[PDB]
């Protein structure tokens, strides 16, 4: 199956997402940090990252920039509803797509499926 | 260079899209119908289509799946009516993205850039 990594600081949301994507057939890894992310990757093959850019003490747009500088991994950002700026900046950093909170899961899974089709 | 086709009935939207994408160095063709699109695609290769749902001949949602069933062509659907069944159906039919009027144009230019990069991988 395709390997998805969810980068999500908030434990409830972490579980909700991992649960939903596991239920849809994916190999899912979770991490709360960009260090966690950098670790799963150097150490495992990852097809797509769902990256919540509201990471306390961390810059998720610069994490995006770094990822795309190094690899063609799929990147879908999770942004807040007060984040218009982050949308365009996030795409400029190299994200393939973004979705906003609150997270509409049915639509997110279709975006993930379509991007994975492009990736593989 | 990359070839984009704009399929759009509303003239101001069509004019803004062709103008912005021409400045980015793309080769751009415009049309206002499914038939017009089909003619262009028989005559030249097309990398990416910006496609309105509202067309005079066939629904753009149906055009989307007809195209995607054969091709990896980029498809971004454009609508003037935020509507959930159109959005989910459109993405399920194979659209790479779905955007609403009035267009966030700078955002669309970057989306197009990234999608073309992704198709070229």
From Swiss-Prot, chain A:
Signal peptide: none
Post-translational modification: Phosphorylated and dephosphorylated by TorS.
This protein's GO CC annotations: cytosol; protein-DNA complex
Keyword terms of this UniProt record: Activator, Cytoplasm, DNA-binding, Phosphoprotein, Transcription, Transcription regulation, Two-component regulatory system
Keyword Cytoplasm (UniProt): yes
Record domain Response regulatory: where: 3-116
UniProt KW Cytoplasm keyword: yes
Localization in the cell: Cytoplasm
Transmembrane segments: none
Subunit: Interacts with TorI. TorI binds to the effector domain of TorR. This interaction, which does not interfere with TorR DNA binding activity, probably prevents the recruitment of RNA polymerase to the torCAD promoter.
Protein name (record): TorCAD operon transcriptional regulatory protein TorR
Protein source organism: Escherichia coli (strain K12)
Whole-protein residues included: 2 to 121 of 230
Curated annotation (Swiss-Prot), chain B:
GO biological process, one term: regulation of DNA-templated transcription
Chief subcellular location: cytoplasm
GO cellular component terms attached to this protein's record: cytosol; protein-DNA complex
Name this protein carries in UniProt: TorCAD operon transcriptional regulatory protein TorR
Molecular functions (GO terms): phosphorelay response regulator activity; transcription cis-regulatory region binding
Lineage top rank: taxon: Bacteria
Modified residues (4-aspartylphosphate): 52
Residues of the Response regulatory domain: 3-116
Modification after translation: Phosphorylated and dephosphorylated by TorS.
This protein's UniProt keywords: Activator, Cytoplasm, DNA-binding, Phosphoprotein, Transcription, Transcription regulation, Two-component regulatory system
Range covered out of full length: 2 to 122 of 230
Subunit organization: Interacts with TorI. TorI binds to the effector domain of TorR. This interaction, which does not interfere with TorR DNA binding activity, probably prevents the recruitment of RNA polymerase to the torCAD promoter.
Job of this protein: Member of the two-component regulatory system TorS/TorR involved in the anaerobic utilization of trimethylamine-N-oxide (TMAO). Phosphorylated TorR activates the transcription of the torCAD operon by binding to four decameric boxes located in the torCAD promoter. Box1, 2 and 4 contain the DNA sequence 5'-CTGTTCATAT-3' and box3 contains the DNA sequence 5'-CCGTTCATCC-3'. Phosphorylated as well as unphosphorylated TorR negatively regulates its own expression by binding to box1 and 2.
Signal peptide: none
Localization in the cell: Cytoplasm
